[PDB]
Amino acid sequence: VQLQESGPGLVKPSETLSLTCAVSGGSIGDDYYWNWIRQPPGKGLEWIGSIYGSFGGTNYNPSLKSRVTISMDTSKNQFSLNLSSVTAADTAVYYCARGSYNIVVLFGYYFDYWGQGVLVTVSSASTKGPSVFPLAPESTAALGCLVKDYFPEPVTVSWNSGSLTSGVHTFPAVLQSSGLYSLSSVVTVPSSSLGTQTYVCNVNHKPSNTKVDKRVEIKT
């Protein structure tokens, strides 16, 4: 039983935020509550609303009720969120979550399974793809990649298509006064391996379709 949010990571102020949750390992039509929950970075959790799988009834957070629509699709096994006329207050990590229960009238319900969450940024700023620069490289050596000047979050970085995980450290991004982000990812490797083993950082910034595998070599 798994849930997965998807949708645009960037929405302009006053527009409508739309998200979908794909549910696996169980029928959405079963006797569960299906929920949308959000958390602005650095702030608290907030229940948005629910749709009841068996009968399709919705309940919404009263402070959001006028702007919120929750739907479900029995085929596809999905339910979704529409949040209209957004502002920067709506910038948040959005989660879908299953609400299970025993009896409800005696016990209410609780959220046992959650999606991984999707960040949605509400901003009028333009999407901007990063530049990806190698950070070129004793018994041990640090090498890396600079992912420079992008918007919005997030960027993902893996190494050698996910086969190199040991010694990898991807750093949280800096937000510069420009309004653009930069992050770096570093891997420490044996120096004897250099010139033999190839190291490639796999960078993805989906909002800008910037998908780069950058080879990192010692400077010559």
């Binding site: 620069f133 070129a136 640090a142």
Partner: protein, 210 residues
């Protein structure tokens, strides 16, 4: 809403209780208060449900109770792991669901750790675009406070510096990074640049050069 202490500070090994004050329309209307743990980078984690039940996977150290309209989470034998935000929540008659405001739990007494510093010069291809970004990566330190100083030929550099707020690594130490954004002309105009990280009165410095 449901009211929690914003902050609680305790020491390793000790026990802590976090309260959650609601109404007779939620906490006092059902045996349906639940508790969630949240670390940055992961979905909230269910700790307690139906006031005091633990799902499989949640340790013995977590327990829940309620009295009237106030629910309580107790965590025993506090470890570095337990540093997180904790939320209570409840169904509310007869139709909605409400989270507590959250409680930031700090666990003190963790071992001091000095930072490791890695400094990279600009790449060749960035320079070809007439820019130069120096990257100072700072890792494995505790507590999570550092001061960064950049120098060019031993002179202080104030312009072009951006430095992140420290964030926890998986190993419960902190990481941070500092970026010095220059032009290529600037980079080539000096003999060297240094990143100096000061942590609890001790300093670690790295230098790069064109």
């Amino acid at each position: 809403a449901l009211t929690q202490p914003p902050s609680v500070s305790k020491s390793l090994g000790q026990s802590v209780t976090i309260s959650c004050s609601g109404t007779s329309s939620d906490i006092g209307a059902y045996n349906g208060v639940s508790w969630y743990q949240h670390h940055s980078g992961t979905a909230p984690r269910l700790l307690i449900y139906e006031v005091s039940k633990r799902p499989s996977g949640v340790s013995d150290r977590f327990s829940g109770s309620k009295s009237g309209n106030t629910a309580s989470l107790t965590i025993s034998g506090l470890q570095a792991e337990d540093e997180a935000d904790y939320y209570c929540g409840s169904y509310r008659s007869g139709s909605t669901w409400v989270f507590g405001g959250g409680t930031r739990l700090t666990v003190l007494g963790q071992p001091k750790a000095s930072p490791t510093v890695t400094l990279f010069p600009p790449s060749s291809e960035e320079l070809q675009a007439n820019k130069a970004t120096l990257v100072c990566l700072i890792s494995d330190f505790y507590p999570g406070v550092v001061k960064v100083a950049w120098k060019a030929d031993g002179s202080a550099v104030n312009a072009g510096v951006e430095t992140t707020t420290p964030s926890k690594q998986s190993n419960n130490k902190y990481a941070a990074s500092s970026y010095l954004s220059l032009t290529s002309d600037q980079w080539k105009s000096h003999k060297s640049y240094s990143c100096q990280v000061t942590h609890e009165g001790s300093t670690v410095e790295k230098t790069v050069a064109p």
